[PDB]
Amino acid sequence: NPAIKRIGNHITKSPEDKREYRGLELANGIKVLLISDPTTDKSSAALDVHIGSLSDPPNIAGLSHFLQHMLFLGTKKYPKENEYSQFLSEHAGSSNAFTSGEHTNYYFDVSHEHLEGALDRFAQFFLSPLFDESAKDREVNAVDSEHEKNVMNDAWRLFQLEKATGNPKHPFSKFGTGNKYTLETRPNQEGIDVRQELLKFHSAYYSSNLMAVVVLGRESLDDLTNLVVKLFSEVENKNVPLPEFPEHPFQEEHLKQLYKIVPIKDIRNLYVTFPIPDLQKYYKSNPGHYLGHLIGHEGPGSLLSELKSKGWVNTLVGGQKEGARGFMFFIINVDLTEEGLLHVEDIILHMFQYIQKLRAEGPQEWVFQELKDLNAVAFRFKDKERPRGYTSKIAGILHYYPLEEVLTAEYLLEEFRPDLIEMVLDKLRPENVRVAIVSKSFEGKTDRTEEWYGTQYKQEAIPDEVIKKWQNADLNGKFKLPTKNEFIPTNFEILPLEKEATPYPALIKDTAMSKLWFKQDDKFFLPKANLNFEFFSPFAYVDPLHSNMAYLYLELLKDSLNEYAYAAELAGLSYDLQNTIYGMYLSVKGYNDKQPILLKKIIEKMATFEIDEKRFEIIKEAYMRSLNNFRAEQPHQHAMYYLRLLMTEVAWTKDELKEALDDVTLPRLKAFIPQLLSRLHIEALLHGNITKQAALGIMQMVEDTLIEHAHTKPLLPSQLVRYREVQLPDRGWFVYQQRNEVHNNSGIEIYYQTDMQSTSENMFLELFAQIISEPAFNTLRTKEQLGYIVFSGPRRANGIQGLRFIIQSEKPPHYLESRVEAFLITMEKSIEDMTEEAFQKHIQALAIRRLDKPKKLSAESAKYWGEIISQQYNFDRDNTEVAYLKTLTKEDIIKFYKEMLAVDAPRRHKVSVHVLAREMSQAPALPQPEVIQNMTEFKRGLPLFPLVKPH
């Protein structure tokens, strides 16, 4: 009554949504939404503060980002640093946060039982954080490492370069991430106490009038309402005026500019930008969504289609980009072919010709109506989100929409306002444009460097006579509006559940040609289906040349199918087609109504495909770069890759693929396809709103189309080989070493192979991984500050398993190696002394994690699909393994550690991948390792495991 100041009438929800909701506004100022899902397996909460990096003090970059790392490391009520992240891992929860221009968003999940405890430790973040002084000095490295990781990333360099080329006076130009220089080194010199400024900032800006909160749990709406006022009405209201940025960072002198930028990767893009007013207030019209939908269209007669036909671009992104309260952007972005790079002036002329077509036709109401009705259906039949992401998302939009309209806001449109559409289109003119070109061909032709990333670039005014030519853009007869979307689903009838329906997928077809798994959706009752198909052919991956052609084949298919499939995707019917090391994979997801039509179109195109010579030469060139560009990926992911290579029977390197790519010629590909298609086996999972006989009907048309157009015949049982994992010797230690030529950081992966997956070995590892998970992050990242990325947990490949550690660091790996090793003895000593109640707490956290129910169809499909592709077929895996997990004693875990994982275990199987940077508590003594010189020699030098036996 007293701490609450207003109560949500009905929160308009989707008719299918079975959770219940209540909006609140506390006397506080805080806007709240509560979600009662009596069935939820995990409770969650999020809090969004409408302040962010855009409000960082000019002389301390990344203060608010640094503040958000800091809130995690202890408060008054709970003073031990990791009490937060520890509580969560012992009760099956996880937590995370992000910082943007105007928001700082914090969120967690946890067992539906331990919501009150978890929410308490979370609420403290906003009442009285410690900002411990020693914790300040450590966690600044984490932020510094977070930046280090991005320095060599092209998307970030570009992100910050935009800001470095607008008004320097505007808060837009601020460096939002911060690093050790700005957060520590600069301020110590300038005589600034950072902890003070952290505290000064928290109190000045972390005010309740600027906070939204979302809590979801099993507890009822009354219980929850009490729980939040208990914990949050005690937050002070300093009545902080919400920052507004009415002036655009792009003024008169910032338009008609051209930017020539050197990338890190070999990529060619064109970025076209128009400054615009904050469209946020017109949300129910979305004039920007309407113009983006058209400019961004990929169907017949679209801007993309003509630009692709000219052979200039491959992909196009168009529409409205957020800025802040008071300013926004409209963008049209394209990648460029070699030809395209030479023809930028023309590409842009085409852009303006398409905009001209829109001017000369004026707003199309049927288009708006089509988008409204699609949204209507989308919203009606939306999948039940996971709590963590849902609370977070909502907590964010509570700042933009009255409490009743939050669930519908970012979905439903209402008034077609043709006048605003005209108002926005009017801003998309040549005199209003900033143009940026990214290409390796500007290497050493640039004369500017951007401070924070070191991005090489050049700034030119666009010649007036060029602006003038674009202003006179006439009508190009190749640009038509889209036609009515004929993929819109109309039939949403959920078919009655069948008499012979199974809880798990039943094997309903078992020929030499087809293995079909089927389950009629029994949990969700949405008019959708997931249709998955693995096709096996030995010719898919027989050698690098063939691997290359497999890839290109499917890439060219999707390219030619794209015009057709775009409309389908917009209507919530999508597909996924890609080559695998055993063949191809295809999945059709979405509304079941028109699924047959698209699927058959795909198999038809697949089996009768006619290559276009120009498309072939263009995609090939892009794949060439794509392969080369791996050198500019991150050390930690180089490490992961190298080891994937070392540990798999057959694996082709990127160099091997790159070299063999020069030999893929047009005819050699035409020949390849019928060869690939002639002998197949198809394993499938069809899962959703379909009957067991519509399923058989699906398989039959898939087969029938293949037999009929590609003369496909069955494979032999003996041809269906899976790959084995390299089998490491007891007491052996191997190191493969390589350098990353792009990042000045190192990566590492450490792998302790245990044994073949079996209920027992599976759960020994999974329990240990659980017990060590949290301490691992806290010791190596939080205490020792080795790097922003520190990972651990299970590794599962080709039926085998083991423990892994991934670290990316400033330190060299030979060192990171001893520190992980140092951590391991510590976890032993810490399990010896570990209390019997702490043990069951963990066993329980694994339990809830594994027995976590799927929220949507796809999560369920993925669980079964994992079981099918891995050829283990254990669909009731969770139950038996969790049931077996519970019987596990504390000394089982110790026996298992002692025998497999310990430094002097009789059966220790260690491989390490050390990726060196661009320029290169007591730890135990380690053996001299055997240094892998050759990946092939190494693989040949030892045995290969069996393959798993199919349950």
Residues that bind Zn ion (CB under 5 A): 146
- Report the nearest approach of Zn ion to the CB of residue 788 (Å): 8
Which is nearer to Zn ion, 90 or 784 (by Cβ)?
784
- Report the nearest approach of Zn ion to the CB of residue 53 (Å): 11
- Report the nearest approach of Zn ion to the CB of residue 137 (Å): 17
Handedness of CA 430, 433, 434, 436 (dihedral sign): negative
Which is nearer to Zn ion, 100 or 737 (by Cβ)?
100
Identity of the residue numbered 830: S
Which is nearer to Zn ion, 96 or 840 (by Cβ)?
96
| DSSP-based three-state secondary structure for 546 | helix
| DSSP-based three-state secondary structure for 808 | strand
**Cβ-proximal residue to Zn ion, closest one:** 146
- Report the nearest approach of Zn ion to the CB of residue 49 (Å): 15
Neighbouring residues of 313: CB distance < 8 A, sequence distance ≥ 6 = 270, 304, 307, 334, 335, 336, 337, 340, 347
Do 677 and 712 form a contact (C-beta atoms < 8 A)?
yes
- Report the nearest approach of Zn ion to the CB of residue 146 (Å): 5
- Report the nearest approach of Zn ion to the CB of residue 388 (Å): 18
Tell me whether strands 732-739 and 930-931 are parallel, antiparallel or unpaired.
parallel
- Report the nearest approach of Zn ion to the CB of residue 52 (Å): 12
Which is nearer to Zn ion, 141 or 333 (by Cβ)?
141
Q: For residue 326, give the nearest of 405, 264, 406, 245 by alpha carbon.
A: 245
- Give, rounded to a whole angstrom, the gap between the first and last alpha carbons of the chain: 59
Return the ∠ at Cα 926 (arms to 924 and 928), rounded to 5°.
Answer: 170
Ranges of beta strands (E only) in 378-454 are 434-438, 448-449
Neighbouring residues of 53: CB distance < 8 A, sequence distance ≥ 6 = 62, 63, 64, 65, 99, 100, 101, 174, 176, 177
Which is nearer to Zn ion, 314 or 809 (by Cβ)?
809
In angstroms, what CA-CA distances link 368 with 287, 406, 659, 702, 722? 9, 22, 50, 36, 50
Backbone phi, then psi, for 418, in 5-degree steps? Answer: -60, -20
**What residue has token string 């540990």?**
647
| DSSP-based three-state secondary structure for 260 | strand
CA atoms lying within 13 Å on the CB side of residue 181: 6
Q: How far apart are alpha carbons 714 and 679 in whole angstroms?
A: 6
Which is nearer to Zn ion, 358 or 806 (by Cβ)?
806
- Report the nearest approach of Zn ion to the CB of residue 397 (Å): 22
Which is nearer to Zn ion, 146 or 197 (by Cβ)?
146
In angstroms, what CA-CA distances link 140 with 137, 265, 463, 786? 6, 29, 46, 12
**What residue has token string 């293949």?**
706
- Report the nearest approach of Zn ion to the CB of residue 135 (Å): 15
Which is nearer to Zn ion, 148 or 555 (by Cβ)?
148
Which is nearer to Zn ion, 122 or 274 (by Cβ)?
122
| DSSP-based three-state secondary structure for 882 | helix
- Report the nearest approach of Zn ion to the CB of residue 232 (Å): 25
Which is nearer to Zn ion, 146 or 683 (by Cβ)?
146
- Report the nearest approach of Zn ion to the CB of residue 586 (Å): 38
What's the DSSP call for residue 943? -
Which is nearer to Zn ion, 56 or 146 (by Cβ)?
146
